[PDB]
């Protein structure tokens with residue numbers, strides 16, 4: 001009688017009025033997300049593997065990197081193959097309501113976790129680079145451990161609403177994947193949406209901007225300070241300190257790119273959702289929602305590749321364990337120099 005009917009999940013009327021997209025579209029969708037599964041799990045596993053097992057990557061702050069990779073790993077796993085990919089190739093979500101809820105909840109829980117984790121990373125950056133060299137503070141296992149616990153609590157908190165009625169996780173677009181309900185406009189649903197956007201999204205963003213804008217409005221605070229101590233009878237040994245700042249600065253840079261990646265990837269979909277909840281629902285067409293959600297879902301497969309082309313110590317480790325990966329991005333000793341000087345200790349004024 002209909003092409004959208006699902007015996008397990010009641011599809012919202014809105015997605016029911018559209019014609020069914022072509023077969024080629026479903027197949028491309030499944031192939032697409034399936035490849036995010038491969039790259040995502042593959043790439044994130046490597047970072048988790050390499051970071052937890054390499055000695056040069058054993059600093060507390062790196063725990064955030066691992067947590068981020070775990071987040072992205074699980075997102076790519078659950079959101080790709082087999083729940084969505086298989087659903088696409090059958091042009092139907094054949095896994096039941098319970099799976100859909102788990103799917104949507106897992107998508108949100110780790111989506112909120114990746115930015116909040118980034119927030120914790122932006123904080124570390126502010127303590128090492130954002131503050132003055134005299135008060136510079138490195139991350140401690142204690143601190144880091146507590147921070148990720150906050151991350152986990154926070155992430156689960158703002159994504160579990162729909163699990164208890166304060167919102168919902170159902171099918172969207174072509175009905176082969178799940179997410180939260182941004183169509184229904186009841187008090188309950190709308191409050192959870194507002195909470196997701198404000199607490200889950202805007203929240204960590206503020207932390208980010210407040211930390212990076214704070215690192216920018218301190219580049220000069222540091223510019224001067226570097227000199228005052230430089231001519232401060234600071235001998236050739238000064239170079240060391242300088243290398244350290246370069247090394248840290250590079251990582252801070254990286255942090256911003258992965259954050260930029262996240263925003264560029266999620267902001268579109270976010271917007272399409274808001275239109276459906278506050279604007280012309282007629283704009284929210286099958287592709288209007290689908291294509292931008294795919295872009296968002298792939299977000300969880302980028303950091304690893306970003307790291308592989310800009311992270312020196314990490315690039316080192318790869319060359320030493322899975323060198324084929326660095327083919328087009330060949331590694332060289334010179335990439336780790338700044339870390340050498342920054343750590344090479346001076347023997348009593350040398």
Ligand SMILES: *C/C=C(C)/C=C/C=C(C)\C=C\C1=C(C)CCCC1(C)C
Pocket residue numbers: 079104107108109111112159177178179180196197200201266267269270273293296297
């Ligand atoms: C494919 C499945 C998806 C995208 C499930 C998403 C769930 C969810 C609660 C998402 C929340 C958001 C982000 C994460 C970042 C961008 C803004 C939100 C609030 C849409």
